[PDB]
From a paper:
Normally, these elements reside passively integrated in host bacterial chromosomes under the control of a master repressor protein, Stl (SaPI transcription leftward). Instead, SaPI activation depends on the formation of a complex between Stl and specific phage proteins, which act as inducers of the SaPI life cycle. Contrary to the classical phage and SaPI repressors, which are dimers, the SaPI1 repressor StlSaPI1 presents a unique tetrameric conformation never seen before. To derepress SaPI1, the phage-encoded protein Sri binds to and induces a conformational change in the DNA binding domains of StlSaPI1, preventing the binding of the repressor to its cognate StlSaPI1 sites.
Our previous structural analysis suggested the importance of residue L201 for tetramerization since their mutual interaction projecting from the middle of α8 nucleates the hydrophobic core. In support of this, a StlSaPI1 repressor carrying an L201E mutation (StlSaPI1 L201E), which introduces a charged residue into this hydrophobic environment, formed dimers in solution and confirmed the role of this helix in StlSaPI1 tetramerization. Furthermore, we solved the structure of the Sri-StlSaPI1 L201E complex, confirming both the dimerization state of the L201E mutant and its ability to interact with Sri, as our previous co-expression and SEC-MALS experiments suggested. The Sri-StlSaPI1 L201E structure was determined at 2.97 Å resolution by molecular replacement using the wt Sri-StlSaPI1 monomer structure that was previously determined as a model. The asymmetric unit of the crystal showed a monomer of StlSaPI1 L201E bound to a molecule of Sri. This complex formed a dimer with the symmetric molecules with identical organisation to that observed for the dimer formed by subunits A and B in the crystal asymmetric unit of the wt Sri-StlSaPI1 complex (RMSD of 1.2 Å for the superimposition of 489 Cα atoms of wt dimer with mutant crystallographic dimer), confirming the A–B subunit organization for the dimeric StlSaPI1. The Sri molecule binds to StlSaPI1 L201E in a disposition identical to that previously observed in the wt Sri-StlSaPI1 complex, indicating that the L201E mutation did not affect StlSaPI1 binding to Sri. However, although the Sri fold in both wt and mutant StlSaPI1 complexes is identical (RMSD of 1.5 Å for superimposition of 42 Cα atoms), the 7 C-terminal residues were not visible in the complex with the StlSaPI1 L201E mutant. Corroborating this, the Sri-StlSaPI1 L201E complex was unstable during the purification process and we observed Sri released from the complex during gel filtration chromatography. In contrast, the plasmid expressing the dimeric StlSaPI1 L201E repressor showed extremely high reporter expression even in the absence of prophage induction, confirming its inability to cause repression.
Numbering used by the authors:
A (entry chain A), C (entry chain A): -1 to 242
B (entry chain E), D (entry chain E): 0 to 43
């Protein structure tokens, strides 16, 4: 006794603690259409929207469980066993149920999609590189922004605007014995001074550097990482910058 | 094991099927598995 | 032999290493009018624009030298000796040169201005409090923004968007042995994980807490600090929250 | 002192007149002044 496509989708979406919005961001599909598919207010969907939803879970799973080798195989095998479960739905309109035709068709649809995405990135390589990007947490879904507000390094190093903390661990002026209260700094006592910012930047610069791996050339390492060159060819080239 | 890997479904917050596909790796050899069973489940 | 008002303004503006833009932000006065006054493409200005420019230097000096008691007196006395120098310009149109009338008039113009500013703040107390503000560095000049992007605490604690570092101390995934390269994370290898962010937040929470002074009540401490209550009355009340 | 407090004008980046109004505090008593002369000029 099989469940309907809508029932199956809701089971998976919920079991991964994803909201309709969250999955609609991870996938091309609208909040409204997702919802309607799960109710049965929309019939069994197109094969292309099915592939889009799987691409949705694909992005998430890789965020959560990881792209690592031990999970890499588990993930590819999983997404396949779901793609079959969908086209074997009680209300399915797919009798070409030869899995290996669909599984291969999905991998050949995914690849086509990657290329489009990378072409669209290449156009805004400037703003991607300079971190002038608003990237929804968990997702590869992004929106270009006027400055790199979400770059922690930039926030600490920029001289354009005052940086604050919560209205808590404040009185960053230990000099609270100044007679008439600093003009309009009865509002902005949260402002970190230039000294503090550089001490915090150095703290983090150390912390990160005795883990991970410092990159000598930025322009270069990025430029080789983002292109239509073979995976196994460029991994060598990345290791060359990390170990000369 | 039995069906007492609802623990994985809840802490990793992954689907029932995926929690099985983890068990499926070195299945019955939970001893052999523990090296990987305690990897992303460790530094989490 | 006196210098013209324009010559005097440029001398002070430059001696404080302020740009026409910088001073035009600190003061109500436009970039264009400042420039024209310094050339003599504009005649001797109104008394009200003179007061505005001094208010400009006032804000800056307090940022640079400090509102502290030893400098508080130096600052008030300085701004006065400049207000006289301006109205004693070679091209000055002020023969009511009784300093104590102008000095008092300026202090009574400043006070009027403070009230207006605080009234205008009160309207947006919400966005000021929640740090949804873009405050030009050095200045009290601010612009309301949709989120508290410049609040360092919020950036580290929020779950809406990925946080980056410079394209340098990266490969935040030590797992660079994953076969086919993490989908579209050949672009976003700069993303700090949830673990790192909380370690950096705690680092800073410690660093700040073994200096400065933690504030128990935010709503309260802020609400009493921002109002038309006497300075000497509220200083007592602030010390009460810092020391019970 | 003399006119060799261009040093203050440059490091503090303050106006000639303000650099004098600093000297004016405990003026001639640069000894007495050093306690405040080395305050905002110290932790800078």
């Amino acid at each position: 006794i099989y469940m309907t496509f809508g029932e199956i989708l809701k089971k998976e979406r919920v079991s991964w603690k994803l909201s309709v919005k969250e999955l609609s961001t991870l996938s091309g599909v609208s909040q409204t259409y997702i919802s309607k598919l799960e109710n049965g207010k929309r019939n069994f969907p197109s094969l292309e929207t099915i592939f889009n939803l799987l691409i949705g879970f694909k992005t998430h799973i890789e965020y959560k469980m990881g792209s690592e080798s031990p999970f890499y195989e588990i993930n590819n095998s999983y997404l396949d066993e779901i793609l079959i479960m969908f086209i074997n739905s009680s209300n399915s309109t797919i009798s070409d149920r030869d899995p290996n035709e669909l599984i291969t068709q999905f991998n050949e649809y995914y690849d086509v999609t990657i290329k489009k995405k990378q072409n669209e990135n290449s156009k805004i390589e400037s703003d991607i590189f300079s971190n002038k990007i608003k990237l929804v947490k968990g997702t590869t879904k992004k929106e270009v922004i006027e400055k790199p507000y979400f770059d922690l390094n930039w926030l600490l190093t920029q001289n354009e605007y005052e940086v604050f903390f919560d209205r808590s661990f404040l009185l960053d002026n230990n000099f609270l014995n100044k007679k008439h209260f600093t003009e309009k700094d009865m509002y902005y006592y949260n402002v970190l001074n230039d000294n503090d910012l550089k001490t915090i930047k150095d703290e983090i610069v150390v912390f990160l550097l005795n883990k991970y791996n410092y990159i000598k050339n930025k322009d270069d390492f990025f430029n080789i990482f983002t292109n239509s060159e073979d995976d196994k060819t460029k991994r060598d080239a990345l290791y060359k910058i990390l170990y000369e | 094991p039995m069906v007492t890997k609802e623990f994985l479904k809840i802490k990793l917050e992954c689907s029932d099927m995926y929690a099985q596909k983890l068990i499926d790796e070195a299945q019955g050899d939970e001893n052999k598995l523990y090296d990987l069973f305690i990897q992303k489940l460790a530094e989490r």
